[PDB]
Amino acid sequence: SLERSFLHEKYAHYFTLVAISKDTDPTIELLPNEPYAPLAENLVLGYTAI
Amino acid sequence: SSFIVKYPEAMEKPVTAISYQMDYLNLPENLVNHYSAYTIGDDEPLVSDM
Amino acid sequence: ILEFTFNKPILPNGEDYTALNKAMSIELTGEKGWIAGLPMTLKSDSGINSGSKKMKLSLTLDSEQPAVVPYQTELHEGSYEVDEPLLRVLFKTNEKEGYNLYRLFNENVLTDLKITVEVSDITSVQLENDLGVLNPQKPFFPFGPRPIKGSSFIVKYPEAMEKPVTAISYQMDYLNLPENLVNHYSAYTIGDDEPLVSDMDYFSVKSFPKSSNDSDQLFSEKSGGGYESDFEFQIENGVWESGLKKELKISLERSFLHEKYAHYFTLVAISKDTDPTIELLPNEPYAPLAENLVLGYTAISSIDFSSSSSENQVSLIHEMPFGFQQVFTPGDTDNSLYLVPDYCHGGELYIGLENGKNLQQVTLLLQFLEGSENPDITDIFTGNQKIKWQYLSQNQWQDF
């Protein structure tokens, strides 16, 4: 189980604040990147019993 | 949220050890730098390290 | 293509393909029965070199011909214990050439058989995405409608993958590709206005079966307008590399920037330094929609009939005037095989008996028309010569 989220719930809030700033001119480097969703493959299992 | 792995053939036996491996697909070059735009308080990053 | 190698030199005078077509006739087991007639004519590269120990046959089938299928007693009307397709060849004994090839092969032992099969213009293939199964008859999105780093495209064709394939390849066309893929993304820049897509190398792939192409670039220039793709694979000894799944898989190194469109669009629109114009707004990112996928392949088998420890996976059957015989089964070895049954000079009469038992006596009356013989023959069973008798056991003739 996950202890902490990947911040999907905050993207809209940070994006907005940068875009409407009156102190700085937004640049691509200041905008938030889309939050990561951990897509995966190749699951392999092994075991021992006695 | 969670992720569950099941394999009845092993679970019905007197298993002493069990393990698994996975690969990720489209992971960013640096997961910490990826969230540098997500800060609180006096511009302190939510994601400080791995 | 079929090659037959023997211990001895077959002929001083070699033979043209038009000579072989007067001596032999070849048929295959297909969907509706035997495939025969004009489609099974030997081609011009077939023939025999005089001093050679090797005979070559060559046959081709049009795309309009029925499929070649495993033998079925209910369809091909016979009684063979064969679970594979059959290729049958008979000699045209009516002709001098047919009769003479039969005699020439009676003693010249066969040692090696090589079989090569080449197939092209295959369209019934199976296609897959990371999202599922695609319909190849309609324009489809390899790598998805919204491609991402790491997404993939897979081509499968079981008929080839079950054979000792030495080579395999395919081709594709793209549909609504922009006039220039690099100029298309000129609005997508970083740092001091430096383009993310600087050239065509941006769009590259990984081939897991280890493609033989000269670069990893996804698009190749079409001799006409637009782009196509081309993927060639080679298997050095016909042996599929252990760990690969018998599928052809391509994956993307870099995305097509779908995830950035909103960000660049916004920044241009809200600029306080410049007035936005249509030339400054980003174009919608491309999704590589495609069609007309075509597959081709080559596979090769080679059998030394005398060698142990070899996968001699072929079955050999002899055709006889009133029946047949299994000669060589898969996995066998031998030292003396022939393509034909051996019939020596003379005459034979066969009598079949019904309802007897293995220890009973049989009394037979032979009623002749006495005197009805040719009086003008000098070879007439002099001395103690007489007619010989034998019985059949396990397909062998045995003396009483």
Coordinates of C-alpha atoms in Angstrom, one line a residue:
Chain A
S1 CA 0.0 0.0 0.0
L2 CA 1.0 3.6 -0.7
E3 CA 2.1 5.9 2.2
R4 CA 1.8 9.2 0.1
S5 CA 0.1 10.1 -3.2
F6 CA 1.7 11.3 -6.4
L7 CA 0.0 14.7 -6.1
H8 CA -2.6 14.3 -8.9
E9 CA -5.0 16.4 -6.8
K10 CA -2.7 19.4 -6.8
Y11 CA -1.9 19.9 -10.5
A12 CA -4.7 22.3 -11.3
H13 CA -3.9 24.5 -8.2
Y14 CA -0.2 25.0 -9.0
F15 CA -0.8 25.4 -12.7
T16 CA -3.2 28.2 -12.1
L17 CA -1.0 30.1 -9.6
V18 CA 1.9 30.2 -12.0
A19 CA -0.2 31.3 -14.9
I20 CA -1.8 34.2 -13.0
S21 CA 1.3 35.5 -11.3
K22 CA 1.7 39.3 -11.4
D23 CA 5.3 39.1 -10.1
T24 CA 6.9 37.0 -12.8
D25 CA 6.4 36.2 -16.5
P26 CA 5.5 32.5 -16.8
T27 CA 8.0 30.3 -18.8
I28 CA 7.8 26.6 -19.6
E29 CA 10.3 25.9 -16.8
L30 CA 8.0 27.3 -14.2
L31 CA 4.9 25.3 -15.0
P32 CA 4.2 22.0 -13.2
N33 CA 4.6 18.8 -15.1
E34 CA 1.8 16.3 -15.1
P35 CA 1.9 14.0 -12.1
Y36 CA 3.3 10.5 -12.7
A37 CA 1.1 7.4 -12.7
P38 CA 3.4 4.3 -12.2
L39 CA 2.6 2.1 -15.2
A40 CA 4.4 -1.3 -15.1
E41 CA 5.1 -4.6 -16.8
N42 CA 7.0 -8.0 -16.7
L43 CA 6.0 -9.2 -13.3
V44 CA 7.9 -12.4 -12.3
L45 CA 7.3 -14.6 -9.2
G46 CA 9.4 -17.2 -7.4
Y47 CA 9.2 -19.4 -4.2
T48 CA 10.5 -22.2 -1.9
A49 CA 8.6 -24.7 0.2
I50 CA 9.8 -27.4 2.7
Chain B
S1 CA -4.4 2.7 -2.6
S2 CA -3.0 -0.8 -3.0
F3 CA -1.6 -3.6 -5.3
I4 CA -2.1 -7.3 -4.7
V5 CA -0.3 -10.4 -6.1
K6 CA -1.9 -13.9 -5.7
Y7 CA -0.7 -17.4 -6.7
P8 CA -2.7 -20.4 -5.1
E9 CA -0.2 -23.0 -6.1
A10 CA 2.4 -21.6 -3.7
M11 CA 0.0 -20.4 -1.0
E12 CA -1.3 -23.9 -0.4
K13 CA 2.2 -25.2 0.3
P14 CA 4.5 -24.8 3.4
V15 CA 6.3 -21.9 1.8
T16 CA 9.4 -20.6 3.5
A17 CA 10.2 -17.8 1.1
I18 CA 8.5 -15.9 -1.8
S19 CA 9.4 -12.9 -3.9
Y20 CA 8.7 -10.9 -7.0
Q21 CA 10.1 -8.3 -9.5
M22 CA 8.6 -5.5 -11.7
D23 CA 9.7 -3.0 -14.4
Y24 CA 8.4 0.6 -14.9
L25 CA 7.6 2.0 -18.4
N26 CA 7.6 5.8 -18.9
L27 CA 9.3 7.0 -15.7
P28 CA 10.9 10.5 -15.9
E29 CA 14.6 11.0 -16.0
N30 CA 14.5 12.2 -12.4
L31 CA 11.4 11.8 -10.2
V32 CA 12.5 14.4 -7.7
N33 CA 13.3 17.1 -10.3
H34 CA 9.9 16.3 -12.0
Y35 CA 8.0 17.9 -9.1
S36 CA 10.2 20.9 -8.5
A37 CA 7.2 23.2 -9.3
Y38 CA 5.2 21.8 -6.4
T39 CA 6.3 23.7 -3.3
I40 CA 4.8 25.0 0.0
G41 CA 5.5 27.7 2.6
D42 CA 8.7 29.6 1.6
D43 CA 9.1 27.7 -1.7
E44 CA 10.0 24.4 0.0
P45 CA 9.6 21.2 -2.2
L46 CA 6.9 18.7 -1.3
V47 CA 9.2 16.0 -2.7
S48 CA 12.6 16.5 -1.2
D49 CA 14.0 13.1 -2.1
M50 CA 13.2 9.5 -3.2
Chain C
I1 CA 12.5 -25.5 -54.2
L2 CA 13.7 -29.1 -53.8
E3 CA 17.3 -30.4 -54.1
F4 CA 18.2 -34.1 -54.3
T5 CA 21.8 -35.3 -53.9
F6 CA 22.9 -38.9 -54.7
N7 CA 26.1 -40.9 -54.4
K8 CA 26.8 -41.2 -58.1
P9 CA 26.7 -38.9 -61.2
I10 CA 23.3 -39.3 -62.9
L11 CA 24.1 -38.5 -66.5
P12 CA 26.7 -37.5 -69.1
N13 CA 24.2 -35.3 -70.8
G14 CA 22.5 -32.9 -68.5
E15 CA 18.8 -32.1 -68.8
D16 CA 16.7 -29.1 -69.5
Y17 CA 13.6 -28.2 -67.5
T18 CA 11.5 -29.1 -70.5
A19 CA 12.9 -32.6 -70.4
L20 CA 11.9 -33.1 -66.8
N21 CA 8.3 -31.9 -67.5
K22 CA 8.0 -34.9 -70.0
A23 CA 9.2 -37.4 -67.4
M24 CA 7.4 -36.4 -64.2
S25 CA 4.1 -35.1 -62.8
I26 CA 3.7 -33.4 -59.3
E27 CA 0.6 -32.9 -57.1
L28 CA -0.1 -31.3 -53.6
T29 CA -2.7 -31.8 -50.9
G30 CA -4.9 -28.8 -50.8
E31 CA -8.2 -27.5 -49.4
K32 CA -10.5 -29.1 -52.0
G33 CA -8.5 -32.2 -52.8
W34 CA -5.3 -32.5 -54.9
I35 CA -3.8 -29.5 -56.6
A36 CA -2.8 -30.6 -60.0
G37 CA -2.5 -29.6 -63.7
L38 CA -0.9 -26.5 -65.1
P39 CA -0.2 -24.8 -61.6
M40 CA 2.3 -27.6 -61.0
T41 CA 4.6 -27.2 -64.0
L42 CA 8.3 -27.2 -63.3
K43 CA 9.9 -23.8 -63.7
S44 CA 13.0 -22.8 -65.8
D45 CA 15.6 -23.0 -63.0
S46 CA 15.0 -26.7 -62.5
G47 CA 17.2 -29.3 -64.2
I48 CA 20.2 -31.7 -64.0
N49 CA 23.9 -30.9 -64.7
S50 CA 25.6 -33.9 -66.4
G51 CA 28.5 -34.5 -64.1
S52 CA 26.5 -33.4 -61.0
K53 CA 25.1 -35.6 -58.3
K54 CA 22.3 -33.1 -57.7
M55 CA 18.8 -32.8 -59.2
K56 CA 16.8 -29.6 -58.8
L57 CA 13.1 -29.1 -58.9
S58 CA 11.2 -25.8 -58.8
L59 CA 7.5 -25.1 -58.4
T60 CA 5.4 -22.0 -57.8
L61 CA 1.8 -21.2 -56.8
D62 CA -0.2 -18.1 -57.6
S63 CA -2.0 -16.1 -55.0
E64 CA -5.2 -17.3 -56.5
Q65 CA -4.5 -21.0 -55.7
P66 CA -6.1 -23.0 -52.9
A67 CA -4.2 -23.4 -49.6
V68 CA -1.9 -26.4 -49.1
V69 CA -3.2 -28.4 -46.1
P70 CA -2.4 -31.5 -44.1
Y71 CA -3.4 -34.8 -45.5
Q72 CA -7.0 -36.1 -44.8
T73 CA -8.2 -39.6 -45.8
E74 CA -11.7 -38.2 -46.2
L75 CA -10.6 -35.5 -48.6
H76 CA -7.5 -36.7 -50.5
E77 CA -9.0 -40.3 -50.9
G78 CA -6.2 -42.5 -49.5
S79 CA -4.9 -44.5 -46.6
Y80 CA -1.5 -42.9 -45.6
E81 CA -0.4 -42.5 -41.9
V82 CA 0.7 -38.9 -42.5
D83 CA -0.2 -35.9 -40.3
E84 CA 1.5 -33.4 -42.6
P85 CA 0.9 -32.1 -46.2
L86 CA 1.9 -34.4 -49.1
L87 CA 3.9 -33.7 -52.2
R88 CA 3.5 -36.6 -54.7
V89 CA 5.6 -37.2 -57.8
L90 CA 4.9 -39.9 -60.4
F91 CA 6.8 -40.9 -63.4
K92 CA 5.3 -40.7 -66.8
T93 CA 6.1 -44.3 -67.7
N94 CA 4.2 -43.9 -70.9
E95 CA 7.1 -41.8 -72.3
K96 CA 10.7 -42.8 -72.9
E97 CA 12.0 -40.0 -70.6
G98 CA 9.8 -41.2 -67.7
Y99 CA 10.8 -44.8 -68.0
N100 CA 14.4 -43.9 -68.3
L101 CA 14.5 -41.7 -65.2
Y102 CA 12.9 -44.5 -63.3
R103 CA 15.7 -46.9 -64.3
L104 CA 18.5 -44.3 -63.6
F105 CA 17.3 -43.9 -60.0
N106 CA 17.0 -47.6 -59.2
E107 CA 20.6 -48.0 -58.0
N108 CA 21.8 -44.5 -57.5
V109 CA 21.5 -44.1 -53.7
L110 CA 20.0 -40.8 -52.3
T111 CA 22.0 -39.2 -49.5
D112 CA 20.6 -35.7 -48.9
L113 CA 17.4 -33.6 -49.3
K114 CA 17.2 -29.8 -49.0
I115 CA 13.9 -27.9 -48.9
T116 CA 13.6 -24.1 -49.3
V117 CA 10.3 -22.2 -49.1
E118 CA 9.8 -18.5 -49.9
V119 CA 6.5 -16.7 -49.4
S120 CA 5.5 -13.1 -50.1
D121 CA 2.6 -10.6 -50.0
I122 CA 1.0 -12.0 -46.8
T123 CA -1.8 -9.8 -45.4
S124 CA -3.6 -12.1 -42.9
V125 CA -1.6 -11.1 -39.9
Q126 CA -2.4 -10.4 -36.2
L127 CA -1.8 -6.9 -34.8
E128 CA -1.6 -5.7 -31.3
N129 CA -1.2 -2.6 -29.2
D130 CA -0.6 -2.0 -25.5
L131 CA -4.4 -1.5 -25.4
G132 CA -5.4 -4.6 -27.3
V133 CA -6.2 -6.2 -30.7
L134 CA -6.2 -4.1 -33.9
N135 CA -8.2 -4.6 -37.1
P136 CA -5.7 -4.6 -40.0
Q137 CA -8.4 -4.0 -42.7
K138 CA -9.0 -0.4 -41.4
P139 CA -6.5 2.4 -40.8
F140 CA -5.1 1.7 -37.3
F141 CA -2.9 3.4 -34.8
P142 CA 0.3 1.5 -34.1
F143 CA 1.5 2.7 -30.7
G144 CA -1.9 4.1 -29.8
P145 CA -4.0 7.2 -30.6
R146 CA -2.0 9.2 -28.1
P147 CA 1.6 7.7 -28.2
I148 CA 3.8 7.8 -25.2
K149 CA 7.5 7.0 -24.4
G150 CA 7.7 3.2 -24.3
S151 CA 4.5 2.3 -26.1
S152 CA 4.8 -0.5 -28.6
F153 CA 3.5 -2.3 -31.7
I154 CA 3.5 -6.1 -32.3
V155 CA 3.1 -8.2 -35.5
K156 CA 2.3 -11.9 -35.3
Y157 CA 2.0 -14.7 -37.9
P158 CA 2.0 -18.3 -36.5
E159 CA 2.4 -20.0 -39.8
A160 CA 5.9 -18.5 -40.2
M161 CA 6.8 -18.6 -36.5
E162 CA 6.4 -22.4 -36.4
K163 CA 9.0 -23.0 -39.2
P164 CA 12.8 -22.7 -39.3
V165 CA 12.6 -19.1 -40.6
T166 CA 15.9 -17.5 -41.7
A167 CA 14.4 -14.2 -42.7
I168 CA 11.2 -12.2 -42.2
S169 CA 10.1 -8.6 -42.9
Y170 CA 7.3 -6.1 -43.3
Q171 CA 6.2 -2.8 -44.8
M172 CA 3.6 -0.1 -43.8
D173 CA 2.1 3.2 -45.2
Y174 CA 1.2 6.4 -43.2
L175 CA -2.0 8.3 -43.8
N176 CA -2.2 12.0 -42.8
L177 CA 1.4 12.8 -42.2
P178 CA 2.4 16.6 -42.3
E179 CA 4.4 17.9 -45.2
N180 CA 7.4 18.3 -42.9
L181 CA 7.4 16.6 -39.4
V182 CA 10.3 18.7 -38.2
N183 CA 8.7 22.0 -39.2
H184 CA 5.4 20.8 -37.7
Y185 CA 6.9 21.2 -34.2
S186 CA 8.8 24.5 -34.6
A187 CA 6.6 26.1 -31.8
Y188 CA 7.8 23.6 -29.2
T189 CA 11.1 24.9 -27.9
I190 CA 13.1 25.0 -24.6
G191 CA 15.8 27.1 -23.0
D192 CA 16.9 29.9 -25.4
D193 CA 14.2 29.0 -27.9
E194 CA 15.9 25.7 -29.0
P195 CA 13.6 23.2 -30.8
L196 CA 12.8 19.9 -29.1
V197 CA 12.7 18.2 -32.5
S198 CA 15.8 19.2 -34.2
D199 CA 15.7 16.6 -37.0
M200 CA 14.2 13.2 -38.0
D201 CA 16.4 11.3 -35.6
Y202 CA 14.0 12.4 -32.9
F203 CA 11.6 9.8 -34.0
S204 CA 13.3 6.4 -33.4
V205 CA 12.5 2.8 -32.2
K206 CA 13.9 -0.3 -30.5
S207 CA 13.6 -3.6 -32.3
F208 CA 13.6 -6.5 -29.9
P209 CA 14.3 -9.3 -32.5
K210 CA 17.3 -7.1 -33.4
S211 CA 16.4 -5.5 -36.8
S212 CA 19.0 -5.5 -39.6
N213 CA 18.1 -2.0 -40.7
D214 CA 20.9 0.6 -40.9
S215 CA 19.4 2.9 -38.3
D216 CA 16.7 3.1 -35.7
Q217 CA 14.8 5.9 -37.5
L218 CA 11.0 5.3 -37.6
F219 CA 10.2 6.9 -40.9
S220 CA 12.0 6.3 -44.2
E221 CA 11.7 8.6 -47.2
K222 CA 9.1 7.4 -49.7
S223 CA 10.3 7.5 -53.3
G224 CA 7.1 9.4 -53.8
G225 CA 5.6 11.8 -51.3
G226 CA 5.2 11.0 -47.6
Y227 CA 6.6 8.2 -45.5
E228 CA 6.5 4.5 -45.1
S229 CA 8.2 2.2 -42.6
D230 CA 10.4 -0.8 -43.3
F231 CA 11.6 -3.5 -40.8
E232 CA 13.9 -6.3 -41.8
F233 CA 14.9 -9.2 -39.5
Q234 CA 17.5 -12.0 -40.0
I235 CA 18.1 -15.2 -38.1
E236 CA 21.7 -16.4 -38.7
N237 CA 21.2 -20.1 -38.5
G238 CA 17.4 -20.4 -38.6
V239 CA 17.3 -20.7 -34.8
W240 CA 15.1 -18.3 -32.9
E241 CA 16.9 -16.6 -30.1
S242 CA 16.0 -18.1 -26.7
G243 CA 13.9 -15.8 -24.6
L244 CA 12.1 -14.0 -27.5
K245 CA 8.4 -14.7 -27.8
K246 CA 8.1 -15.4 -31.6
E247 CA 6.6 -12.0 -32.4
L248 CA 8.0 -8.9 -34.0
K249 CA 8.1 -6.1 -31.5
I250 CA 8.8 -2.3 -32.0
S251 CA 8.9 0.3 -29.2
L252 CA 9.1 4.1 -29.1
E253 CA 12.2 5.9 -27.7
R254 CA 10.5 9.3 -27.5
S255 CA 6.9 10.6 -27.5
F256 CA 5.2 12.8 -30.0
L257 CA 4.7 15.6 -27.3
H258 CA 0.9 15.2 -26.8
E259 CA 1.5 16.0 -23.1
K260 CA 2.9 19.5 -24.0
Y261 CA 0.4 21.0 -26.3
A262 CA -1.7 22.7 -23.6
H263 CA 1.4 24.3 -22.0
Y264 CA 2.8 25.8 -25.2
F265 CA -0.6 26.9 -26.5
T266 CA -1.2 28.8 -23.3
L267 CA 2.2 30.5 -23.2
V268 CA 1.8 32.0 -26.6
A269 CA -1.7 33.1 -26.0
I270 CA -0.9 35.0 -22.8
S271 CA 2.4 36.6 -24.0
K272 CA 2.8 40.3 -23.1
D273 CA 5.8 40.7 -25.4
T274 CA 4.3 39.7 -28.7
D275 CA 1.0 39.7 -30.5
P276 CA 0.0 36.1 -31.2
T277 CA -0.4 35.2 -34.8
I278 CA -1.4 31.8 -36.4
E279 CA 2.2 31.1 -37.2
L280 CA 3.2 31.3 -33.5
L281 CA 0.7 28.8 -32.2
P282 CA 1.6 25.1 -31.8
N283 CA 0.1 22.6 -34.2
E284 CA -1.7 19.6 -32.8
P285 CA 0.8 16.8 -32.1
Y286 CA 0.8 13.9 -34.7
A287 CA -0.6 10.5 -34.0
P288 CA 0.9 8.0 -36.6
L289 CA -2.2 6.5 -38.2
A290 CA -1.3 3.7 -40.7
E291 CA -2.5 1.1 -43.3
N292 CA -1.5 -1.6 -45.9
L293 CA 0.7 -3.8 -43.7
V294 CA 2.4 -6.5 -45.9
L295 CA 4.5 -9.4 -44.5
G296 CA 7.0 -11.8 -46.2
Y297 CA 9.4 -14.7 -45.1
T298 CA 11.9 -17.5 -45.9
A299 CA 12.4 -20.9 -44.1
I300 CA 14.9 -23.7 -44.8
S301 CA 15.3 -27.4 -43.8
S302 CA 18.2 -29.7 -44.7
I303 CA 18.4 -33.5 -44.1
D304 CA 21.3 -35.9 -44.2
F305 CA 19.7 -39.3 -44.3
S306 CA 22.8 -41.0 -43.0
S307 CA 23.5 -38.8 -40.0
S308 CA 22.7 -39.6 -36.5
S309 CA 22.1 -36.8 -34.0
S310 CA 20.2 -34.7 -36.5
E311 CA 16.7 -33.6 -36.8
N312 CA 15.8 -35.6 -39.9
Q313 CA 12.2 -34.4 -39.8
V314 CA 10.8 -35.8 -43.1
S315 CA 8.7 -38.8 -44.1
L316 CA 9.4 -40.8 -47.3
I317 CA 6.9 -43.0 -49.0
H318 CA 7.2 -45.2 -52.2
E319 CA 4.4 -45.5 -54.7
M320 CA 3.9 -49.0 -56.2
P321 CA 1.5 -50.4 -58.9
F322 CA -0.9 -51.8 -56.4
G323 CA -0.2 -50.0 -53.1
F324 CA 2.6 -48.1 -51.2
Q325 CA 5.3 -48.5 -48.6
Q326 CA 6.6 -46.3 -45.8
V327 CA 10.4 -46.1 -46.2
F328 CA 11.8 -43.4 -43.9
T329 CA 10.1 -41.9 -40.8
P330 CA 11.0 -38.7 -39.0
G331 CA 14.0 -39.2 -36.8
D332 CA 15.4 -42.2 -38.7
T333 CA 18.8 -42.8 -40.3
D334 CA 19.8 -45.1 -43.1
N335 CA 22.7 -45.9 -45.4
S336 CA 20.7 -46.8 -48.5
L337 CA 17.6 -45.1 -49.7
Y338 CA 16.2 -44.8 -53.2
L339 CA 13.5 -42.5 -54.6
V340 CA 11.8 -45.5 -56.3
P341 CA 10.9 -49.2 -55.9
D342 CA 13.2 -51.6 -57.6
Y343 CA 11.5 -53.9 -60.2
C344 CA 13.8 -56.3 -62.0
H345 CA 13.2 -57.9 -65.4
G346 CA 10.5 -60.5 -65.6
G347 CA 6.8 -61.3 -64.8
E348 CA 4.8 -61.7 -61.6
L349 CA 1.4 -63.1 -60.7
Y350 CA -0.3 -62.3 -57.4
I351 CA -3.0 -64.5 -55.8
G352 CA -5.0 -63.2 -52.8
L353 CA -6.7 -65.7 -50.6
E354 CA -9.8 -65.0 -48.4
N355 CA -10.8 -66.5 -45.0
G356 CA -7.8 -68.9 -44.4
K357 CA -5.9 -69.5 -41.1
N358 CA -2.2 -69.5 -40.4
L359 CA -1.9 -73.3 -40.1
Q360 CA -4.4 -74.7 -42.7
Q361 CA -3.9 -76.5 -46.0
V362 CA -4.9 -75.0 -49.3
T363 CA -5.5 -77.0 -52.4
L364 CA -5.7 -75.1 -55.7
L365 CA -6.7 -76.3 -59.2
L366 CA -5.0 -74.5 -62.1
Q367 CA -7.0 -75.0 -65.3
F368 CA -5.0 -74.2 -68.4
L369 CA -5.9 -74.2 -72.0
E370 CA -3.4 -76.8 -73.1
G371 CA -1.4 -76.1 -76.2
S372 CA -2.0 -72.3 -76.1
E373 CA 1.6 -71.2 -76.0
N374 CA 4.0 -69.7 -78.5
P375 CA 5.8 -72.5 -80.4
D376 CA 8.5 -70.3 -81.8
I377 CA 10.6 -69.4 -78.7
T378 CA 14.1 -70.8 -78.0
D379 CA 14.2 -70.0 -74.2
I380 CA 11.9 -72.7 -72.9
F381 CA 12.9 -73.8 -69.3
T382 CA 15.5 -76.3 -70.2
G383 CA 17.3 -78.5 -67.6
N384 CA 15.8 -78.1 -64.1
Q385 CA 14.4 -74.6 -64.4
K386 CA 10.9 -73.9 -63.1
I387 CA 8.4 -71.2 -61.8
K388 CA 9.3 -69.8 -58.3
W389 CA 6.8 -69.3 -55.4
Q390 CA 6.9 -66.9 -52.4
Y391 CA 4.5 -65.6 -49.7
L392 CA 4.0 -62.1 -48.1
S393 CA 4.9 -61.2 -44.5
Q394 CA 5.2 -57.7 -43.0
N395 CA 5.5 -56.2 -46.6
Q396 CA 8.4 -58.5 -47.4
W397 CA 8.5 -61.5 -49.8
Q398 CA 9.7 -64.7 -48.3
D399 CA 10.6 -68.1 -49.6
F400 CA 8.5 -71.1 -48.7

